[PDB]
């Protein structure tokens, strides 16, 4: 449609120019009318050209990538309108020399104020379209808080906290910060923490490892076979600090399933450490009476 | 390679714009007021777009000139260990140890220090333990000898060079110790690192248990009424 409109406009402009080229206005007044008509044809051809290139830009951006697209389309259409009207006026050239310079200096003063905000606006566009870190419906982390996404506007993005609290971020601020995406991530790993006494024999630790491996093998639905049990520093030679590393069959996008499976794993570890006769105790204290 | 292709596309776009504009200048069809109007439009354009080109260009310099890491290696930023898979002009993508995927800006990373594990040599690890102030010197010497012997018996995982250091005494009751040793690997091999550290900790525990070394709290005296 745009190509056909541009072709028709160009054909009309060429026909008008050729008719006005072979025959030129005789009366001085007719010359001004002919010049105005030629300027109008040129301005219409131009405006169609800007519209066509703007449409091509919008379509390529959409292909690379909806509310944000519509807002961007409206903004660029406004820019197209202002530029085409101003260059039409320049073709008219009705302003005096002092008036044209006055408009130019008004543009200079305008630029500072509005471009100052256009800095944030343009960097937000680049963040949304070029970086494209997340999409509507996925779960993301910013500053360690887990949130969801529903909206995408040019200046702001809207999120829901785990308690469904609705938040409205600026897009420029997010451009400066790191962001994690759960929907785009692969299957994950979770760690459950526990501590045991320094007196625990090595054989008990080996039995605990064997039981943990067996249990994780019996549940392929929730956990990957690969796992690891690691030891952490010893406190006062009384406490051993332990951690179990395991991988879900899901991401953290499935929050409720994540928490329920973690709870089940914790209960299993508790049953283990209770039925293996593993106990933790405080350091003994000696007392002198008087 | 992705960064190279993106840069090629960007520079081709710049080439296209410059060649077309200088072709138009050769044509010289615009009026004097029109040429000046286009020049001032360029002036106004420059501020807005060059403001972002600042970040873009510093990111290019960071990626290509500095070149601190490559795809597949493990790096540290702000103390968190992560992996790398992607390299884009504006952003880099990493995986946390829990496989969480993150999308950094490249300009922000340019301002920050970065550590690379794949480019580093064989490393050192430290295991912490404390013992009582009453421990005799001979017991400490025996512990050092046993630690040296054990590290010698395992050349596969540990370098012969090591050191046992003492740290400040707390209330003249607690001695704080630390053992320094070097792996035969880097921290890029995370699972092997953790497993070997766990084995070393278990060995140290067996030592301190079979050498009859005990730690105790300070005694307390009480007056009854």
Numbering used by the authors:
A (entry chain A): 248 to 312, 507 to 731
B (entry chain B): 507 to 731
Q: Can you provide the manuscript's text about this entry?
A:
Amongst the Arabidopsis MSL channels, MSL10 is enigmatic in that it has two separable functional modalities, regulated cell death signaling conferred by its N-terminal soluble ‘death’ domain and force-activated ion channel activity imparted by its C-terminal portion. When heterologously expressed in Xenopus oocytes, MSL10 is indeed activated by membrane stretch and displays a preference for anions. In Arabidopsis, MSL10 is primarily expressed in the shoot apex, root tips, and vascular tissues, playing a critical role in adaptation to hypo-osmotic shock and induction of programmed cell death. Analogous to DmMSL10/FLYC1, each subunit of the heptameric AtMSL10 channel is composed of a transmembrane domain (TMD) with six membrane-spanning helices (TM1-TM6) and a characteristic C-terminal cytoplasmic domain (CTD) shared by all MscS homologs.
Strikingly, an open structure of the wild-type channel solubilized in detergent micelles or embedded in lipid nanodiscs is achieved in the absence of applied force. Therefore, we asked whether AtMSL10 embedded in a lipid environment, without applied tension, renders a closed conformation. The most pronounced differences come from the outer TM helices, which undergo slight rotation and outward movement from the central pore, in comparison with the structure of AtMSL10 in detergents. Interestingly, the CLD between TM4 and TM5 was completely disordered in the lipid environment, further indicating structural flexibility of this peripheral domain. Remarkably, no discernible densities corresponding to lipids bound to the channel were observed, though the channel was fully embedded in lipids. Therefore, the structures of AtMSL10 in detergent and lipid environments both represent an open, conductive state, further indicating that the wild-type AtMSL10 channel, unlike other MS channels, uniquely favors an open conformation.
